[PDB]
Nucleic acid binder design. Structure first.
Ligand SMILES: [Zn+2]
Lengths: 79, 826, 33, 172, 69
RNA sequence: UUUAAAAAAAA
């Protein structure tokens, strides 16, 4: 579970889980995505994405990082 | 099964009826297909349709041992007139002759027995060990068990234990690639079947044409349901599986899905069916291969290994007629499988047919009602006294043979030998008392160090001296681990066996055995030097060498701890036991016969003579016991309970209350009748009454315990009070009943679900209102409907029209589209 | 006490056809259809 | 009784020892050197080892360990050294009784120690006791001879839930 | 008297031991562990030390020394 | 920019 997960940060306001799911479906099978919302009413600037296969987590990092969505790149990290 | 058989017969003769609780088709026919319970009802109420019958064809008569539903068979056989003739189909069983003798003795006519083990197509049994890499042909078509392959498979299992994501996926993929495609996977759990079916959602056994045909058939089958029902997840999400050629069949599913999957499999459109044991009893649904995932099932009591009977019954579903010339059965064995268990399972024969007769208030009440007959008749002839009567000659011969053998032996001077023997036995008993004193955990535990030398001797078998290693408070029993010589037979199948001493001729393995504390015959005092790492099999032999050296140093036995001073036991009881044993020892030594020689053989012969004497005593005791009807006391207690509640008159004539109680047979009678006569139902609206009755007819191990708000709690607690009264009265009549269990039998888990369903909620809503499988909800709903019909009948019997109207409305509300969906086999 | 007798009818190999009948009666062969 | 007292000359501690702080004061091992080559030859090594034991305990306790809370009371088979009354005490009699208690007696041969009095343990648990050291074994059977067989399960301790864990199945 | 017999029980070697070569085959010591922290704590160390003594003597004696009067 | 084991069935 944890190994196949992938943490994300620097997501713009309009970035919804649907956009991330669509983007990462191409990278690999996207199990699901999390955008926890703190005591602010909107999801935090970070998120989590779960891939079916661990092989996606490297390849996705090898493929996507700092992608300019909504005029802001997106950073990708691990646990 | 009745529906399927009716379809077959109708396609054969067309002069066929059907009479089950759910439906009745063409009742005025000549060939009626009806479940046993309907037949029992007709017998008890004496319908004219029964008059014209000439043949009765019981099917799956071996089902008579169903514990709970077994009785409903014997009654039907007993109450049938003697002019009829039976045809008892069954599965292979050893004690068929006993059943035939019972029929002869009961109806006084010849009864034949045609026993045959012949099968059309041979079977090959393979075993797949957990962690292995192949299938080992344990049993060949010829029936000759192959010992070498079985040993190799179990050796692989052991090596894996002491060392395609899932095994089932590998097995099924291999089956597909070896052209064994039509496969039935018997897993003894609904969740296991679900999981294994889901895991295989990456293969495809169906050609495109098969996909089109399956889609069309499924749509045609489901078109009967309403549009909202078609939207249910259960119907929609099975369609992909059937499209790709994978099916699931277990009691949890919806009935209509079960029937559709049965049709598809029978027509060959499904090539891998994950099913529980129920599908085994299906009719005309064979397959080329059968796969057992787990050889463990939970029966009514608790987990257990599947008996050889069940294994034979399920494996019989392997190998079609003619199309395939070989049948394959694959058994997957996990770590907790001993070679002895596997051998018994593969080589054992079918279980014997033993009755399950047990009284029910319905039987007692019905027999009391009718005249010129009483329950004693049923008890006398109910294939349970018959087995004991058949057994009596055996015990008679046994006691006679033991008596003649006992008198055969010759003792020259029995008085002196007997006195000496009794003195010796008293000494042994006093020694046992002393040992029971030593093993108090507050006295011997300080002495069980990891080197201590203790002899452990479970009655009958003695392991010899062994070195203690560890002890612990298991959970207050104390488990002491010693290091004994094991037999290399109980050491290889240790997964289930306990332990066994090394046979005298051979050499053991010197393994660690967890014995109980009170099995230490003697706690010697010579603490060896323990290697401190007893894993390698070389140190555990240096320990044996050390023990032998210590024994060779003490030529006359190793010293033992003195219970009094060495262990510091102070309580006077030990003192008195010591005095008694001292006195008995002196009286023994003084005996004139002690010094004489050759008294050892005389002592042994006297001991065996006493053994034979006690064996005769027990055998004749039980022979005397068995010469009386068994459940007679139970019948008296039941009659006491019935009369004390007003059902049965003091002269044993059914009172109006008992007459009413006769009708209700699908649930408890005393509770329902008492509540009906206490006016409990005369205020509740139809919904609460239906919900409560649902609480009556539900029995499933679920711990959801949903909260009942207002209209479902008060009635539930009133029912609880009435049940408590019944339990107390029954207990007062010397009737074995655990009040807590009786009050806990009525599980109200579905009360709210059934209430909401009666209110008019859609099925999808209620299916999401709880956790039980939808199939269980449907089953309980059907059972509740039939109970409500019986309740309407009882209300009519008492002439209380209000209850009739209330229960009629309850029937109307809960009888609609999906739950009571007519089976497609009709 | 039951009074029955189990006469083992001879048969072609494959099945063990045997008939249990009351002791007071005497076994007789089955007439052909 | 007088003859027994005469024979128990070795097991006779003098009466009058001003024993205070019984936990650390009071005697330590009493060794009865026996008439054989090993003992006669290594008497001095034995005495030096006992002195080293005392020194090691003092060093390791007065500096590192600061609990010394639990106590192993003598087992029921523990004798008390028989004092010879050459003087009268007042209140330390009970303290002397507690301090001069024999807990464990061992007669060492070459290949097996003939033992009696056993060893004390805390609430019947070798793991929590002081002088107990269990060997290492496999325990292959797991089926008692005369009986039926045997909160954050990840940790293995049934005291806390995994939700608040400080030391970190087909429902579908 | 019972108490004194109990106490003297410690000084009682069992009758029956087959002792030949009295110089080596026989007791090495007899340690009476007392009720204080040190003896309770270093029980295993003491036993290991005695075993080491036996081992060292066996080595040195059976290997090198010849007279050892 | 890191929210336990559980089958089967009916008047
Ligand atoms: Zn934890």
């Amino acid at each position: 579970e944890a190994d196949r997960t992938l943490f994300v940060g620097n997501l713009e306001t309009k970035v919804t889980e649907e956009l991330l799911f669509e983007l990462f479906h191409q990278a690999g099978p996207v199990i699901k995505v999390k955008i926890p919302k703190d005591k602010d009413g909107k999801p935090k600037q970070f998120a989590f994405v779960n891939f079916k296969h661990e092989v996606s987590v490297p390849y996705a990092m090898n493929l996507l990082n700092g992608i300019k969505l909504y005029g802001r790149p997106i950073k990708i990290q691990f646990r | 099964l009745s529906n399927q058989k009716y379809r077959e017969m109708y396609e054969e003769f067309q002069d066929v009826g059907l009479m089950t609780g759910d439906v009745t088709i063409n009742p005025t026919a000549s060939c009626l297909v009806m479940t046993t319970e309907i037949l029992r009802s007709m017998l008890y109420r004496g319908s004219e349709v029964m008059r014209e019958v000439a043949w009765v064809i019981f099917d799956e008569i071996h089902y008579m041992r169903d514990s709970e539903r077994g009785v409903v068979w014997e009654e039907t056989i007993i109450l049938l007139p003697d002019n009829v003739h039976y045809v008892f189909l069954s599965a292979t069983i050893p004690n068929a002759r006993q059943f035939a003798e019972w029929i002869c003795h009961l109806h006084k006519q010849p009864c034949h027995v045609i026993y045959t083990d012949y099968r059309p197509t041979p079977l090959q049994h393979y075993i797949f060990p957990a962690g292995g890499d192949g299938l080992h042909l344990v049993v060949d078509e010829n029936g000759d068990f192959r010992e070498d392959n079985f040993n190799t498979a179990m050796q692989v299992l052991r090596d894996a234990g002491d060392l395609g994501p899932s095994n089932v996926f590998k097995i099924v993929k291999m089956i597909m690639e070896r052209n064994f495609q039509p496969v039935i996977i018997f897993s003894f759990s609904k969740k296991d079947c679900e999981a294994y079916a889901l895991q295989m959602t990456k293969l495809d056994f169906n050609t495109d044409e098969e996909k089109k045909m399956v889609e069309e058939v499924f749509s045609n089958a489901i078109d009967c349901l309403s549009d909202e029902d078609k939207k249910l997840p259960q119907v929609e999400h099975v369609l992909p599986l059937l499209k790709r050629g994978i099916g699931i069949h277990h009691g949890g599913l919806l009935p209509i899905l079960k029937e559709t999957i049965e049709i598809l499999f029978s027509e060959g459109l499904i090539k891998a069916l994950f099913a529980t044991e129920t599908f085994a009893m299906g009719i005309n649904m064979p397959a080329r291969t059968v796969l057992f995932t787990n050889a463990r099932k939970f029966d009514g009591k608790d987990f257990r290994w599947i008996s050889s009977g069940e294994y034979i019954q399920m494996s019989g579903r392997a190998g079609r007629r003619g199309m395939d010339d070989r049948g394959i059965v694959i058994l997957m064995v996990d770590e907790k499988m001993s070679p002895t268990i596997g051998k018994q399972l593969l080589k054992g024969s079918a279980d014997p047919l033993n009755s399950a007769f047990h009284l029910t208030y319905n039987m007692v009440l019905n027999l009391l009602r009718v005249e010129e007959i009483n329950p004693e008749y049923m008890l006398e002839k109910s294939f349970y006294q018959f087995q004991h009567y058949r057994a009596i000659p055996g015990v008679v011969e046994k006691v006679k043979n033991s008596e003649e053998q006992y008198n055969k032996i010759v003792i020259p001077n029995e008085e002196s030998v007997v006195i000496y023997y009794k003195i010796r036995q008293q000494l042994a008993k006093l020694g046992k008392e002393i040992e029971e004193y030593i093993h108090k955990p507050k006295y011997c535990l300080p002495f069980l160090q990891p080197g201590r030398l203790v002899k452990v001797k479970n009655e009958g078998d003695d392991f010899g001296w062994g070195v203690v290693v560890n002890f612990s408070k298991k959970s207050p029993l104390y488990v002491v681990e010693v290091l004994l010589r094991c037999s290399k037979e109980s050491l290889k199948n240790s997964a289930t066996e306990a332990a066994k001493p090394a046979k005298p001729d051979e050499k053991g393995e010197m393994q660690v055995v967890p014995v109980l504390v009170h099995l230490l015959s003697a706690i010697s005092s010579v603490r060896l030097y323990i290697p401190k790492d007893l894993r390698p099999v070389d140190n555990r032999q240096s320990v044996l060498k050390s023990i032998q050296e210590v024994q060779k140093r003490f030529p006359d036995g190793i010293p033992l701890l003195d219970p009094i001073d060495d262990m510091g036991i102070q309580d006077q009881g030990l003192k008195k036991v010591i005095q008694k044993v001292e006195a008995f020892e002196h009286r023994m030594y003084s005996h004139p016969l002690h010094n004489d020689p050759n008294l050892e053989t005389v002592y042994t012969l006297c001991e065996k003579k006493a053994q034979i004497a006690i064996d005769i005593k027990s055998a004749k005791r039980e022979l005397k016991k068995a010469r009386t009807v068994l459940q007679m006391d139970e019948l008296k207690c039941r009659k006491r309970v019935l009369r004390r509640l007003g059902f049965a008159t003091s002269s044993d004539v059914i009172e109006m209350k008992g007459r009413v109680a006769c009708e209700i047979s699908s649930a408890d009678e005393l509770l329902l009748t008492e509540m009906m006569f206490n006016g409990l139902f005369n205020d509740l609206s139809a919904e609460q009454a239906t919900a409560l009755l649902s609480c009556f007819v539900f029995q499933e191990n679920s711990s959801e315990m949903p909260k009942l708000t207002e209209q479902l709690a008060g009635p539930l607690r009133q029912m609880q009070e009435c049940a408590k009264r019944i339990a107390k009265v029954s207990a007062e009549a010397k009737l074995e009943i655990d009040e807590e269990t009786y009050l806990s039998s009525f599980k109200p888990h579905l009360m709210d679900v059934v209430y909401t369903w009666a209110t008019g909620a859609t099925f999808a809503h209620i299916c999401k209102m709880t956790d039980v499988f939808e199939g269980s909800i449907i089953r309980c709903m059907r059972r509740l409907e039939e109970l409500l019909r019986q309740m309407c009948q009882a209300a009519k019997a008492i002439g209380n029209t209000e209850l009739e109207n209330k229960f009629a409305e309850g029937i109307t509300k809960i009888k609609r589209d999906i739950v009571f969906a007519a089976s497609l086999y009709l | 006490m039951p009074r029955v007798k189990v006469q083992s009818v001879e048969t072609v190999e494959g099945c063990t056809h045997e008939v249990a009948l009351p002791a007071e009666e005497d076994y007789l062969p089955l007439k052909p259809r | 009784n007088q003859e027994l007292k005469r024979k128990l000359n070795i097991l006779t501690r003098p009466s009058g020892i001003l024993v205070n702080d019984t936990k650390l004061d009071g005697p330590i091992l009493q060794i009865l050197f026996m008439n054989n080559a090993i003992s006669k030859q290594y008497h001095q090594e034995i005495e030096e080892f006992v002195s080293n034991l005392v020194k090691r305990f003092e060093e390791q306790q007065k500096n590192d360990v600061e609990k010394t809370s639990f106590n192993l009371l003598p087992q029921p088979s523990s004798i008390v050294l028989e004092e010879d009354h050459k003087v009268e005490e007042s209140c330390a009699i009970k303290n002397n009784k507690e301090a001069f208690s024999v807990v464990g007696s061992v007669l060492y041969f070459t290949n097996f120690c003939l033992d009696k009095l056993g060893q004390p343990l805390l609430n019947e648990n070798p793991q929590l006791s002081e002088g107990w050291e269990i060997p290492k074994y496999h325990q292959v059977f797991s089926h008692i001879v005369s009986l039926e067989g045997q909160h954050c399960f990840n940790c293995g301790s049934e005291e806390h839930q995994m939700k608040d864990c400080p030391m970190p199945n087909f429902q579908q």
